[PDB]
Amino acid sequence: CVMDDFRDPQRWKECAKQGKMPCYFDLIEENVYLTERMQCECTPLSKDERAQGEIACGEDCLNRLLMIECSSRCPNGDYCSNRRFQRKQHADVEVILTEKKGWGLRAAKDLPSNTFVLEYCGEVLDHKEFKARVKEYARNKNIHYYFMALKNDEIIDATQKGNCSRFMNHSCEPNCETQKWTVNGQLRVGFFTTKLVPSGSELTFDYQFQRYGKEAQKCFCGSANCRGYLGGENRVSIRAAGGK
């Protein structure tokens, strides 16, 4: 049961029954909304510059600097290196079973610093849908939580639908960070390495978790500076957790 079985629902379901792969969820290539709601100024690379290894819409791209992706109308067209979310230019990753955090993610090759890992895809919810799901997940006695704040009135929920970014565990000393990118006038969240990440190392981010729950989950990241609990010291209200 390899990484490729995630694209094969019949085989993945079988692997899940044998405990070889995590439980089934729906694999989505972009965010699904339950309730629905410009070009850069880079000089186009010549055929010779492309051949010589020159990057199109690299470090000096006006769109990239502002965390905006380019569209098909980019002056660099096909060569544009600034359409990673759209072109699914995800890093080589593996889903692993951890000792006590459940499933996790790890680098399947060495990843340089500020490398796009994956987009945190899911179902985008409003405050009313978020509160409905809070009750659902609490009534189901769910152990793992998959809510990612997008904007004040938008929560990305990857509990039922998402991608393998839903497997990224918390660390008080992480090797990734989230970045909010504008893709087609819509905001998206992606994970980016903050440092060189050797092959086989678990990919982690700092949740900055806003715990509404009565009880805190203990943190097993193992950092010398570990906060002991996901959520830290304080318990917040559901409305605060939801961004109101």
């Binding site: 997940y137 006695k141 769910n142 990612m148 704040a149 989230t178 949740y207 806003q210 009565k214």
Partner: peptide, 12 residues
């Protein structure tokens, strides 16, 4: 009240 639950906040 939910025994567990919380929201992840994007930060840098």
């Amino acid at each position: 009240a939910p025994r567990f639950g919380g929201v992840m906040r994007p930060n840098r």
